[PDB]
């Protein structure tokens, strides 16, 4: 781990994080939002 | 025939007008796209033959106002699931809910 960095990642775990997109439900959050903050996880978010 | 394309609206029903109510979960019903959801005002872009919305899920998306010029962007009312956490029954219950 190198402590600089945002979390305690590798050199070669930076890479295998940040060329690794998740798609999931909740951490995308709405278009046009609902309700609640686009903050952390304070706006809903259940895709259609 | 119904025409829901743009331009202002000329018939409604003898029912008083109630105006547009931002973050609360109301009955919407507006260029021919209803369904039970929060209103907001448009961040999406839209072009002027595309300025209302259904979704491959068969719900409203978006919805030009039939009084105003603004274009409305409708999102389906909040849910959310109830994970309730409680011990046996071979202890007194507790309820916490997520």
Do not use: M, W
Not at chain 1, 30 to 44: K, P, S, V
Not at chain 2, 7 to 31: D, E, Q
Not at chain 2, 59 to 88: H, K, M
């Amino acid at each position: 781990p190198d402590p600089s960095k945002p979390s305690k990642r590798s050199p070669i775990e930076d890479l295998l994080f940040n060329k690794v997109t998740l798609a999931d439900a909740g951490f995308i959050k709405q278009y046009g939002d609902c309700l609640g903050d686009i903050a952390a996880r304070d706006l809903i978010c259940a895709q259609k | 025939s119904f025409e829901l394309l743009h331009a202002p609206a000329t018939v409604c029903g003898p029912k008083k007008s109630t105006n547009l109510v931002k973050n609360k979960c109301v009955n919407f019903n507006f260029n021919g796209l209803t369904g039970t959801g929060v209103l907001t005002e448009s961040n999406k872009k839209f072009l002027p033959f595309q300025q209302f919305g259904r979704d491959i899920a068969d719900t409203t998306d978006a919805v030009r106002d039939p009084q105003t010029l603004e274009i409305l962007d409708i999102t389906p009312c909040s849910f959310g699931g109830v994970s309730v956490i409680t011990p046996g029954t071979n202890t007194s219950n507790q309820v916490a809910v997520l």
